[PDB]
Protein backbone atom coordinates (compact mmCIF):
# COMPACT_ATOMS: atom_id res chain seq x y z
CA UNK A 1 0.00 0.00 0.00
CA UNK A 2 2.70 2.47 1.03
CA UNK A 3 4.97 1.65 -1.91
CA UNK A 4 2.28 2.13 -4.57
CA UNK A 5 1.05 5.45 -3.16
CA UNK A 6 4.63 6.67 -2.69
CA UNK A 7 5.41 5.86 -6.33
CA UNK A 8 2.14 7.39 -7.57
CA UNK A 9 2.52 10.67 -5.64
CA UNK A 10 6.32 10.97 -5.34
CA UNK A 11 7.35 12.27 -8.78
CA UNK A 12 4.00 14.12 -9.02
CA UNK A 13 4.32 17.40 -7.10
CA UNK A 14 1.26 18.69 -8.97
CA UNK A 15 -2.18 18.46 -7.37
CA UNK A 16 -5.31 17.27 -9.16
CA UNK A 17 -6.26 20.91 -9.60
CA UNK A 18 -10.00 21.56 -10.04
CA UNK A 19 -11.37 23.45 -13.07
CA UNK A 20 -9.81 26.62 -11.72
CA UNK A 21 -11.05 29.77 -13.53
CA UNK A 22 -7.90 31.80 -12.73
CA UNK A 23 -6.48 31.98 -16.31
CA UNK A 24 -9.75 32.99 -17.96
CA UNK A 25 -10.64 35.56 -15.30
CA UNK A 26 -7.17 37.12 -15.30
CA UNK A 27 -7.13 37.26 -19.11
CA UNK A 28 -10.60 38.83 -19.06
CA UNK A 29 -9.46 41.40 -16.49
CA UNK A 30 -6.37 42.32 -18.52
CA UNK A 31 -8.38 42.67 -21.73
CA UNK A 32 -10.99 44.83 -19.99
CA UNK A 33 -8.25 47.01 -18.47
CA UNK A 34 -6.46 47.38 -21.81
CA UNK A 35 -9.54 48.30 -23.83
CA UNK A 36 -10.78 50.62 -21.07
CA UNK A 37 -7.47 52.50 -20.93
CA UNK A 38 -7.35 52.71 -24.73
CA UNK A 39 -10.90 54.08 -24.88
CA UNK A 40 -10.38 56.51 -21.98
CA UNK A 41 -7.02 58.10 -22.83
CA UNK A 42 -8.22 58.90 -26.37
CA UNK A 43 -11.72 57.84 -27.42
CA UNK A 44 -15.42 58.58 -26.92
CA UNK A 45 -15.86 58.40 -23.12
CA UNK A 46 -13.53 60.02 -20.59
CA UNK A 47 -14.80 57.98 -17.65
CA UNK A 48 -12.25 57.40 -14.89
CA UNK A 49 -13.96 55.85 -11.85
CA UNK A 50 -14.98 52.55 -13.44
CA UNK A 51 -11.59 51.98 -15.08
CA UNK A 52 -10.13 52.56 -11.61
CA UNK A 53 -12.50 49.86 -10.32
CA UNK A 54 -11.36 47.52 -13.12
CA UNK B 1 43.83 -8.11 -57.53
CA UNK B 2 42.31 -4.93 -58.99
CA UNK B 3 39.48 -6.69 -60.81
CA UNK B 4 37.69 -4.41 -63.25
CA UNK B 5 38.19 -0.87 -61.99
CA UNK B 6 40.41 1.03 -62.85
CA UNK B 7 38.11 3.58 -61.14
CA UNK B 8 37.84 5.81 -64.20
CA UNK B 9 35.51 3.64 -66.29
CA UNK B 10 32.62 3.20 -63.85
CA UNK B 11 33.33 6.60 -62.28
CA UNK B 12 32.78 8.43 -65.56
CA UNK B 13 29.99 6.19 -66.82
CA UNK B 14 28.08 6.81 -63.58
CA UNK B 15 28.70 10.50 -62.85
CA UNK B 16 28.50 11.81 -66.44
CA UNK B 17 24.76 10.96 -66.76
CA UNK B 18 24.19 12.39 -63.27
CA UNK B 19 26.10 15.62 -63.92
CA UNK B 20 24.35 16.02 -67.28
CA UNK B 21 20.98 15.53 -65.59
CA UNK B 22 21.84 18.05 -62.87
CA UNK B 23 23.07 20.55 -65.46
CA UNK B 24 19.80 20.10 -67.37
CA UNK B 25 17.84 20.60 -64.14
CA UNK B 26 19.72 23.82 -63.40
CA UNK B 27 19.30 24.95 -67.02
CA UNK B 28 15.53 24.46 -66.78
CA UNK B 29 15.40 26.17 -63.37
CA UNK B 30 17.25 29.15 -64.88
CA UNK B 31 15.42 29.14 -68.22
CA UNK B 32 11.89 29.17 -66.85
CA UNK B 33 12.41 32.87 -66.00
CA UNK B 34 13.97 33.06 -69.45
CA UNK B 35 10.94 31.28 -70.89
CA UNK B 36 8.69 33.84 -69.18
CA UNK B 37 10.83 36.69 -70.53
CA UNK B 38 10.69 35.26 -74.05
CA UNK B 39 6.94 34.64 -73.93
CA UNK B 40 6.14 38.07 -72.48
CA UNK B 41 6.09 41.05 -74.85
CA UNK B 42 9.58 42.09 -73.78
CA UNK B 43 10.45 43.28 -77.30
CA UNK B 44 6.88 43.69 -78.64
CA UNK B 45 7.05 40.31 -80.36
Amino acid sequence: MTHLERSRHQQHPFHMVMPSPWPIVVSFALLSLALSTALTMHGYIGNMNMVYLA
Amino acid sequence: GRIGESWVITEGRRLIPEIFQWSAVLSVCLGWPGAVYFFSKARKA
Partner: protein
Amino acid sequence: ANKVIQLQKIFQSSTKPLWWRHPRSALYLYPFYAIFAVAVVTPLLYIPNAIRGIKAKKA
Protein backbone atom coordinates in the same frame (compact mmCIF):
# COMPACT_ATOMS: atom_id res chain seq x y z
CA ALA C 1 -2.03 26.69 15.85
CA ASN C 2 -5.21 25.23 17.36
CA LYS C 3 -7.18 25.25 14.08
CA VAL C 4 -4.71 24.15 11.38
CA ILE C 5 -4.87 20.39 11.94
CA GLN C 6 -8.66 20.32 12.33
CA LEU C 7 -9.19 22.47 9.23
CA GLN C 8 -6.83 20.26 7.22
CA LYS C 9 -8.71 17.16 8.39
CA ILE C 10 -12.05 18.73 7.45
CA PHE C 11 -10.72 19.70 4.01
CA GLN C 12 -9.41 16.17 3.45
CA SER C 13 -12.74 14.68 4.55
CA SER C 14 -14.74 17.08 2.33
CA THR C 15 -12.88 17.26 -1.00
CA LYS C 16 -14.80 20.23 -2.38
CA PRO C 17 -13.77 23.20 -4.55
CA LEU C 18 -13.61 26.90 -3.59
CA TRP C 19 -11.04 25.88 -0.94
CA TRP C 20 -13.57 26.91 1.78
CA ARG C 21 -11.55 30.06 2.57
CA HIS C 22 -13.48 32.85 0.80
CA PRO C 23 -16.92 31.68 -0.37
CA ARG C 24 -18.62 35.02 0.30
CA SER C 25 -15.85 36.89 -1.53
CA ALA C 26 -16.13 34.53 -4.51
CA LEU C 27 -19.92 34.97 -4.64
CA TYR C 28 -19.40 38.74 -4.46
CA LEU C 29 -16.76 38.79 -7.21
CA TYR C 30 -18.37 36.37 -9.69
CA PRO C 31 -21.29 38.58 -10.89
CA PHE C 32 -19.23 41.79 -10.80
CA TYR C 33 -17.09 40.84 -13.81
CA ALA C 34 -20.15 39.94 -15.89
CA ILE C 35 -21.99 43.10 -14.84
CA PHE C 36 -19.04 45.42 -15.48
CA ALA C 37 -16.78 44.19 -18.28
CA VAL C 38 -19.52 43.05 -20.66
CA ALA C 39 -21.46 46.30 -20.23
CA VAL C 40 -18.28 48.33 -20.79
CA VAL C 41 -17.14 46.37 -23.87
CA THR C 42 -20.54 46.47 -25.59
CA PRO C 43 -20.34 50.27 -26.21
CA LEU C 44 -16.86 49.84 -27.73
CA LEU C 45 -18.48 48.33 -30.82
CA TYR C 46 -22.04 49.64 -30.35
CA ILE C 47 -21.14 53.35 -30.62
CA PRO C 48 -19.06 53.14 -33.86
CA ASN C 49 -21.90 51.21 -35.51
CA ALA C 50 -23.15 54.43 -37.11
CA ILE C 51 -19.55 55.60 -37.58
CA ARG C 52 -18.71 52.41 -39.49
CA GLY C 53 -19.30 52.35 -43.24
CA ILE C 54 -16.85 55.04 -44.42
CA LYS C 55 -16.10 53.73 -47.92
CA ALA C 56 -14.21 56.87 -49.05
CA LYS C 57 -14.42 55.57 -52.61
CA LYS C 58 -12.78 57.79 -55.23
CA ALA C 59 -12.49 57.62 -59.01
